[PDB]
Amino acid sequence: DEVWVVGMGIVMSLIVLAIVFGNVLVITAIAKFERLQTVTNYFITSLACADLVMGLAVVPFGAAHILTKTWTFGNFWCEFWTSIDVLCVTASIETLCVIAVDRYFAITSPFKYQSLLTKNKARVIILMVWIVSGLTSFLPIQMHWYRATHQEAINCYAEETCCDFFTNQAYAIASSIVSFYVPLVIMVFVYSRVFQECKRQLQKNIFEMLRIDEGLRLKIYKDTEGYYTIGIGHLLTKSPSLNAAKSELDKAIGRNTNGVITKDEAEKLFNQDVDAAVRGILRNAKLKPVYDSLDAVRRAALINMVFQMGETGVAGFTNSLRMLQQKRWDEAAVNLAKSRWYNQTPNRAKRVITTFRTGTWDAYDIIQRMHLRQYELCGTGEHKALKTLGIIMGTFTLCWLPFFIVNIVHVIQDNLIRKEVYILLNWIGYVNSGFNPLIYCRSPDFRIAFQELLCLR
Ligand SMILES: Cc1ccccc1CC(C)(C)NC[C@H](O)c1ccc(O)c2c1OCC(=O)N2
């Protein structure tokens, strides 16, 4: 029937056109824009390249082979064509695994992120992915390490006009694990913690702020009052014996620290110190009305003062807390600069005052870079957390999971999987290459770049 060909002709061409136009726009956006050249976007460029070569060489010949029902481009070029298809899917999915690891690595340890991931270490990751992708698709095919299972399969290889997909048990499972199952469990476990790490996204901003204002020390340091503290202003014990400071540290940490702890262990002690401090702000009758009127960023600035002076010291600003409850920011910024706390730590009080003025993360450059990547990936609340993380994992799942499951089950029992269903489920995987430009490019700079290249407003 003419209709079904036309239907395939218009649907398959739509997928080709949508994949190409989406990837070309993403590639040309990062190329002709300077603010869009972040190190996080250095990895998404490999995602679009692995997806553009898909829509330019893999998807087009995928539709041409189905419509004509026979290959008409030589057998070597089909071995070449099959190689590109696997090389791109491997380079696409493994890049999706890199994108998830990259954005998680910056959330947990933000300070190290700007120190390790440079231009060299960014290209090495992309180089390693395409090398792993190239060594699992091209070389096993150019060496004929996949075929020769049955007598029937041999005939289609010798014929220069026949080209189907017949692989043995070894390459069918090995390629599926390297391409899909290894990046799957990683992306599943990474986003499982990303959703868990975002459950306290308000405390993480306070942690990175107090690391600049107060200061994190992994080793036990004596305080000015003569007592031993650890991490960020966390008192170990008021006894002047260092032996008691080690035993108290072992109980809260849970191991033999001998004085030295790690970053995440001090960060977990920070969560107990904040929850014990926020309850104190709600406990004090003078700090609760101020806390109810402050926004999220200024609530952290109020807790910043509690970690330095305490609920007794923060309550000592009758004029400032009075204007904070009345939402008078610029007036409260002057009376805070007149107190004794501003005179002893002017560089810290200014950043706290600047936070109370604008309500942004200004004067904390690293923390402001966090809010952009946190909201882009997670969002604000429970309704936004499962939504954004769900569609990023849902699109990657519904496209490639039904194929590789069918691909692996086919090796279990022959003739159990229909060929037409096998092609459709592989084709559903291609559509994921067209969705990625509209999934990972939701950055504010991407929105500015996309609306400018299309002459929008
Ligand atoms: C050539 C032909 C003929 C009929 C139907 C489809 C096709 C195209 C083919 C099968 C080459 N698509 C490759 C498929 O996207 C794919 C991607 C990554 C992989 O790791 C594997 C994989 O195939 C199974 C596997 O074990 N590994």
Side-chain angles (χ1 to χ4, degrees), residues 277-281 283-285 287 289:
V278 180
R279 296 174 188 269
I281 299 182
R283 186 180 185 180
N284 185 266
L287 302 181

PDB file of all heavy atoms in Angstrom, residues 277-289, unseen atoms left out:
ATOM      1  N   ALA A 277      20.416  24.407  65.342  1.00  0.00           N
ATOM      2  CA  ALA A 277      20.407  25.867  65.329  1.00  0.00           C
ATOM      3  C   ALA A 277      19.109  26.454  64.791  1.00  0.00           C
ATOM      4  O   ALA A 277      18.655  27.491  65.284  1.00  0.00           O
ATOM      5  CB  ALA A 277      21.580  26.398  64.500  1.00  0.00           C
ATOM      6  N   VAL A 278      18.505  25.819  63.784  1.00  0.00           N
ATOM      7  CA  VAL A 278      17.233  26.309  63.259  1.00  0.00           C
ATOM      8  C   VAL A 278      16.134  26.152  64.301  1.00  0.00           C
ATOM      9  O   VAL A 278      15.252  27.011  64.428  1.00  0.00           O
ATOM     10  CB  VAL A 278      16.881  25.588  61.944  1.00  0.00           C
ATOM     11  CG1 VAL A 278      15.560  26.101  61.384  1.00  0.00           C
ATOM     12  CG2 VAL A 278      17.996  25.766  60.926  1.00  0.00           C
ATOM     13  N   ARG A 279      16.170  25.059  65.066  1.00  0.00           N
ATOM     14  CA  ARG A 279      15.215  24.890  66.156  1.00  0.00           C
ATOM     15  C   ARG A 279      15.420  25.937  67.242  1.00  0.00           C
ATOM     16  O   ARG A 279      14.462  26.319  67.922  1.00  0.00           O
ATOM     17  CB  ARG A 279      15.328  23.485  66.747  1.00  0.00           C
ATOM     18  CG  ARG A 279      14.967  22.369  65.780  1.00  0.00           C
ATOM     19  CD  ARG A 279      15.234  21.005  66.394  1.00  0.00           C
ATOM     20  NE  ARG A 279      15.072  19.925  65.425  1.00  0.00           N
ATOM     21  CZ  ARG A 279      13.930  19.280  65.209  1.00  0.00           C
ATOM     22  NH1 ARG A 279      12.843  19.603  65.894  1.00  0.00           N
ATOM     23  NH2 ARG A 279      13.876  18.310  64.305  1.00  0.00           N
ATOM     24  N   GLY A 280      16.656  26.410  67.420  1.00  0.00           N
ATOM     25  CA  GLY A 280      16.904  27.463  68.388  1.00  0.00           C
ATOM     26  C   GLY A 280      16.381  28.813  67.944  1.00  0.00           C
ATOM     27  O   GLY A 280      15.966  29.625  68.776  1.00  0.00           O
ATOM     28  N   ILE A 281      16.400  29.077  66.636  1.00  0.00           N
ATOM     29  CA  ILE A 281      15.817  30.313  66.122  1.00  0.00           C
ATOM     30  C   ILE A 281      14.307  30.308  66.324  1.00  0.00           C
ATOM     31  O   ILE A 281      13.709  31.333  66.675  1.00  0.00           O
ATOM     32  CB  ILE A 281      16.195  30.505  64.643  1.00  0.00           C
ATOM     33  CG1 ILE A 281      17.715  30.602  64.491  1.00  0.00           C
ATOM     34  CG2 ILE A 281      15.523  31.744  64.072  1.00  0.00           C
ATOM     35  CD1 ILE A 281      18.174  30.830  63.068  1.00  0.00           C
ATOM     36  N   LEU A 282      13.667  29.155  66.116  1.00  0.00           N
ATOM     37  CA  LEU A 282      12.241  29.034  66.391  1.00  0.00           C
ATOM     38  C   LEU A 282      11.949  28.959  67.883  1.00  0.00           C
ATOM     39  O   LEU A 282      10.809  29.202  68.292  1.00  0.00           O
ATOM     40  CB  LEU A 282      11.672  27.801  65.686  1.00  0.00           C
ATOM     41  N   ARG A 283      12.951  28.629  68.701  1.00  0.00           N
ATOM     42  CA  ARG A 283      12.750  28.571  70.145  1.00  0.00           C
ATOM     43  C   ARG A 283      12.814  29.959  70.771  1.00  0.00           C
ATOM     44  O   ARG A 283      12.028  30.274  71.670  1.00  0.00           O
ATOM     45  CB  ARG A 283      13.791  27.649  70.780  1.00  0.00           C
ATOM     46  CG  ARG A 283      13.590  27.398  72.265  1.00  0.00           C
ATOM     47  CD  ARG A 283      14.665  26.470  72.810  1.00  0.00           C
ATOM     48  NE  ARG A 283      14.436  26.119  74.208  1.00  0.00           N
ATOM     49  CZ  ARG A 283      15.234  25.330  74.919  1.00  0.00           C
ATOM     50  NH1 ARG A 283      16.320  24.808  74.365  1.00  0.00           N
ATOM     51  NH2 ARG A 283      14.948  25.062  76.186  1.00  0.00           N
ATOM     52  N   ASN A 284      13.741  30.797  70.311  1.00  0.00           N
ATOM     53  CA  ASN A 284      13.851  32.154  70.831  1.00  0.00           C
ATOM     54  C   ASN A 284      12.673  32.994  70.350  1.00  0.00           C
ATOM     55  O   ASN A 284      12.352  33.009  69.158  1.00  0.00           O
ATOM     56  CB  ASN A 284      15.173  32.782  70.390  1.00  0.00           C
ATOM     57  CG  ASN A 284      15.397  34.153  70.997  1.00  0.00           C
ATOM     58  OD1 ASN A 284      15.064  35.172  70.393  1.00  0.00           O
ATOM     59  ND2 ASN A 284      15.964  34.184  72.197  1.00  0.00           N
ATOM     60  N   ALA A 285      12.029  33.695  71.286  1.00  0.00           N
ATOM     61  CA  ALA A 285      10.836  34.466  70.953  1.00  0.00           C
ATOM     62  C   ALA A 285      11.149  35.702  70.121  1.00  0.00           C
ATOM     63  O   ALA A 285      10.235  36.263  69.504  1.00  0.00           O
ATOM     64  CB  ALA A 285      10.101  34.876  72.229  1.00  0.00           C
ATOM     65  N   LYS A 286      12.404  36.145  70.091  1.00  0.00           N
ATOM     66  CA  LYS A 286      12.773  37.319  69.314  1.00  0.00           C
ATOM     67  C   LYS A 286      13.308  36.973  67.932  1.00  0.00           C
ATOM     68  O   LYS A 286      13.297  37.834  67.046  1.00  0.00           O
ATOM     69  CB  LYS A 286      13.816  38.150  70.070  1.00  0.00           C
ATOM     70  N   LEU A 287      13.774  35.741  67.729  1.00  0.00           N
ATOM     71  CA  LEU A 287      14.298  35.321  66.436  1.00  0.00           C
ATOM     72  C   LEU A 287      13.253  34.651  65.556  1.00  0.00           C
ATOM     73  O   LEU A 287      13.441  34.590  64.335  1.00  0.00           O
ATOM     74  CB  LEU A 287      15.481  34.367  66.632  1.00  0.00           C
ATOM     75  CG  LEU A 287      16.662  34.897  67.447  1.00  0.00           C
ATOM     76  CD1 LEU A 287      17.762  33.851  67.536  1.00  0.00           C
ATOM     77  CD2 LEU A 287      17.192  36.189  66.848  1.00  0.00           C
ATOM     78  N   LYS A 288      12.163  34.147  66.142  1.00  0.00           N
ATOM     79  CA  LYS A 288      11.150  33.463  65.337  1.00  0.00           C
ATOM     80  C   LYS A 288      10.383  34.417  64.428  1.00  0.00           C
ATOM     81  O   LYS A 288      10.216  34.094  63.239  1.00  0.00           O
ATOM     82  CB  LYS A 288      10.212  32.665  66.249  1.00  0.00           C
ATOM     83  N   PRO A 289       9.883  35.571  64.891  1.00  0.00           N
ATOM     84  CA  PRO A 289       9.189  36.475  63.956  1.00  0.00           C
ATOM     85  C   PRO A 289      10.073  36.969  62.825  1.00  0.00           C
ATOM     86  O   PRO A 289       9.572  37.219  61.722  1.00  0.00           O
ATOM     87  CB  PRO A 289       8.729  37.629  64.859  1.00  0.00           C
ATOM     88  CG  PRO A 289       8.663  37.040  66.218  1.00  0.00           C
ATOM     89  CD  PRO A 289       9.798  36.069  66.277  1.00  0.00           C
TER      90      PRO A 289
END
